[PDB]
Amino acid sequence: ARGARYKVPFRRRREGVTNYRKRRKLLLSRKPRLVVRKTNKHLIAQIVIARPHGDETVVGLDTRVLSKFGWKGDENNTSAAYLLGLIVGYKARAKGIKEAILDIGLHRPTPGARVFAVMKGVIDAGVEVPHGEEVVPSEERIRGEHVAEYAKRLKEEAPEAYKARFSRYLQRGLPPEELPSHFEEVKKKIVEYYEQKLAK
Amino acid sequence: ARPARCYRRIKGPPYTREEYIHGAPMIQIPKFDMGTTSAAARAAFTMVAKLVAEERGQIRMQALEAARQISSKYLTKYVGDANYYLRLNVVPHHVLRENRMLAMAGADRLQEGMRLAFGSPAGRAARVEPGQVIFYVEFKPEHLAHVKEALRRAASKLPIPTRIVVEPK
Amino acid sequence: VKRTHGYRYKSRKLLSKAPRERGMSGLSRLLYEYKPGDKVVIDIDPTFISTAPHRRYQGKVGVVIGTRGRAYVIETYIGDKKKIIITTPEHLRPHLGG
Amino acid sequence: MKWKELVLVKDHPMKRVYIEKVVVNIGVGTGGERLEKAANLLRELTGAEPSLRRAKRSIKDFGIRKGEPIGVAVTLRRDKAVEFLMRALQAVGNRIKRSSFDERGNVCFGIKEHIMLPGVKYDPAVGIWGMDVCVRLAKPGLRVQLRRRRRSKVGKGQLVTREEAVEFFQKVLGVQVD
RNA sequence: CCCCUGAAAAGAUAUCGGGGGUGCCCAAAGCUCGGCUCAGGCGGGUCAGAAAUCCGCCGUAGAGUGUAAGGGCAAAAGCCG
Ligand SMILES: [Mg+2]
Ligand SMILES: [Mg+2]
Ligand SMILES: [Mg+2]
Ligand SMILES: [Mg+2]
Ligand SMILES: [Mg+2]
Ligand SMILES: [Mg+2]
Known part of the structure; x- marks a missing residue:
């Protein structure tokens, strides 16, 4: 910056995306990393193997893949996080990965978070990811019953606020009060697809 | 004081870190630039005379001071302070040591001979190289004889051979 | 006085770093998987000095003999005596000269 | 006149200025009971839970460790901030010095005695206290400096200036700025 | 016994050589997780002041890190919980 004695930080540190202390602790594991990242619209899930010249991503997907199975919920709610985790876990199991270590980056590990929803989906697909028993969200939140209850109360109380706050659901054709059943159908579709693929 | 031949020769590393030297002497030279020191008035002066060392050695602070007084007094008396700029170009950074039994100067100075022979500070000197510029004079070309005489008188007080080099600015 | 011999007793220049080298170092040295028979160079990292080998092994070429948990066992020589350096990968570099 | 429509709007939707926050501070010397009285006074005055601020450095001339x-x-945001801001401006007299505005959308004013606030009664068990009230104004997009991931610097055009803050206080809050 | 220099860019290296320290201290000054950023400067702010708490801008470490010297350390090895 000013003078030769200024030490410019690492590029990823100064862009604010890599905590190198946590990255070094993760790299000590020598296991594949289940990288989970959040955006304002989507959730990114990757299975990464670190190499000296650059990381190798075995499988990488955001929540745009759920449209292939017919998702009509939000892109990055807890149910979408679970379905993305299921797909990424099945793909990783196909490509030969059987264990992974959760990598949430700069996100906080609060219990019931979407990163743990993705981890639960990956675990249910057949990939072992170590975790505490008190961080994975409840099955009600994974099915999306919180979204349904909020939509029901909003419809009862303020219908115009309901339409404004869930317009994209109504454009997609799924009212938010029917989210758990649709989650069940999509999860059945994904499970049947990848299990038939695994059998074949 | 000892004869200057005792400290003329460079025989060891420089001894200048005053944060590690105990009781280091002060530099007694009161000023280093003589005459018309402001560059706006030095723009008039076009001749440069340089008293330059011929050998490698050490010049004591007192020797540098004596040369400075003799040259500055001659230049003031015969050229006037408004017609010259004189700079003593070297600073006596080196600290000289002497090994001698003495007064209250440590309990290891009370042992005689070469036992605990690391001396106490005894003065200051400037370590010079061949071709090093000891005295730098800026002057108008009419005063060349007086400037050479002042440089000769200054050279008479120094412990090493020197020479005068005249050139244009 | 005779020379004192701490574990790091003449290591000012060897453990100093330039201003452009300050702070954390890159993590690529962690990701080299050395097999038995590989050749490595002992290049001490000053930021992890507690696990670094002695200063007498800096710049020496060793042969990986095995792995102990997360460190590597390296067979090297100091003059003519065989020495065993058990050190983590952050103080090692692969030897490219064979 | 509520928080959501207390906005000063320019010719761009994303350059709307609003009250980011209002912070009320009482700095007392040491006292346990004196600080408890100050904390309770802040709680009643603002409706919000106060936070106790520990001395950063021990100064023995003040006798603080x-x-x-x-x-x-x-720290007050949205509705509580606006309500206390109106009360505090009424207490000060609807007047703020022009030199009180810093060059980055911050304006702080002192309330010498809290009885001047509307709706406050003198109590012998609390005494009479003073406050510093600091209003921080912002434009949309300030989260880029305060978020955790990909934290960066907000561009110069999207930052609140002293002129915009004084114009906000005049035209929107109806305060006399001198 | 320990650090820097001597020590001559591998290793080793002495003098009643130079500059210093050691015979402790700490249930937290030890372990870990998380949050935060220091010295210092500047603008605004009741008592309040050079210096208290508060709002903001700058700030490569100019702070701190028990204790010598040297080395290391900034989403930390510092500060707080
Ligand atoms: Mg010699
Ligand atoms: Mg010995
Ligand atoms: Mg230790
Ligand atoms: Mg050597
Ligand atoms: Mg210690
Ligand atoms: Mg820490």
């Missing part, structure tokens, strides 16, 4: 609480401050 580092880590001990000597302040009570509360």
Whole structure:
């Protein structure tokens, strides 16, 4: 910056995306990393193997893949996080990965978070990811019953606020009060697809 | 004081870190630039005379001071302070040591001979190289004889051979 | 006085770093998987000095003999005596000269 | 006149200025009971839970040690901030010095005695206290500096200037700025 | 016994050589997780002041890190919980 004695930080540190202390602790594991990242619209899930010249991503997907199975919920709610985790876990199991270590980056590990929803989906697909028993969200939140209850109360109380706050659901054709059943159908579709693929 | 031949020769590393030297002497030279020191008035002066060392050695602070007084007094008396700029170009950074039994100067100075022979500070000197510029004079070309005489008188007080080099600015 | 011999007793220049080298170092040295028979160079990292080998092994070429948990066992020589350096990968570099 | 429509709007939707927050501070010397009185006074005055502020450095001329609480401050946002801001401006007199505005959308004013606030009664068990009230104004997009991931610097055009803050206070809050 | 220099860019290296320290201290000054950023400067702010708490801008470490010297350390090895 000013003078030769200024030490410019690492590029990823100064862009604010890599905590190198946590990255070094993760790299000590020598296991594949289940990288989970959040955006304002989507959730990114990757299975990464670190190499000296650059990381190798075995499988990488955001929540745009759920449209292939017919998702009509939000892109990055807890149910979408679970379905993305299921797909990424099945793909990783196909490509030969059987264990992974959760990598949430700069996100906080609060219990019931979407990163743990993705981890639960990956675990249910057949990939072992170590975790505490008190961080994975409840099955009600994974099915999306919180979204349904909020939509029901909003419809009862303020219908115009309901339409404004869930317009994209109504454009997609799924009212938010029917989210758990649709989650069940999509999860059945994904499970049947990848299990038939695994059998074949 | 000892004869200057005792400290003329460079025989060891420089001894200048005053944060590690105990009781280091002060530099007694009161000023280093003589005459018309402001560059706006030095723009008039076009001749440069340089008293330059011929050998490698050490010049004591007192020797540098004596040369400075003799040259500055001659230049003031015969050229006037408004017609010259004189700079003593070297600073006596080196600290000289002497090994001698003495007064209250440590309990290891009370042992005689070469036992605990690391001396106490005894003065200051400037370590010079061949071709090093000891005295730098800026002057108008009419005063060349007086400037050479002042440089000769200054050279008479120094412990090493020197020479005068005249050139244009 | 005779020379004192701490574990790091003449290591000012060897453990100093330039201003452009300050702070954390890159993590690529962690990701080299050395097999038995590989050749490595002992290049001490000053930021992890507690696990670094002695200063007498800096710049020496060793042969990986095995792995102990997360460190590597390296067979090297100091003059003519065989020495065993058990050190983590952050103080090692692969030897490219064979 | 509520928080959501207390906005000063320019010719761009994303350059709307609003009250980011209002912070109320009482700095008392040391006292346990004195600080408890100050904390309760802040709680009643603002409706929000105060936070105790510990001394950062031990200064023996003030008789304060580092880590001990000597302040009570509360951060107000949205509706509570606007209500107390109106009350505090009424207490000060609907008047703010032009030199009180810093060059980055911050304006702080002192309330010498809290009885001047509307709706406050003198109590002998609390005494009479003073406060610093600091209003921080912002434009949309300030989260780029305060978020955790990909934290960066907000561009110069999207930052609140002193002129915009004074114009906001005049035209929107109806305060006399001199 | 320990650090820097001597020590001559591998290793080793002495003098009643130079500059210093050691015979402790700490249930937290030890372990870990998380949050935060220091010295210092500047603008605004009741008592309040050079210096208290508060709002903001700058700030490569100019702070701190028990204790010598040297080395290391900034989403930390510092500060707080
Ligand atoms: Mg010699
Ligand atoms: Mg010996
Ligand atoms: Mg240790
Ligand atoms: Mg050597
Ligand atoms: Mg210690
Ligand atoms: Mg830490």
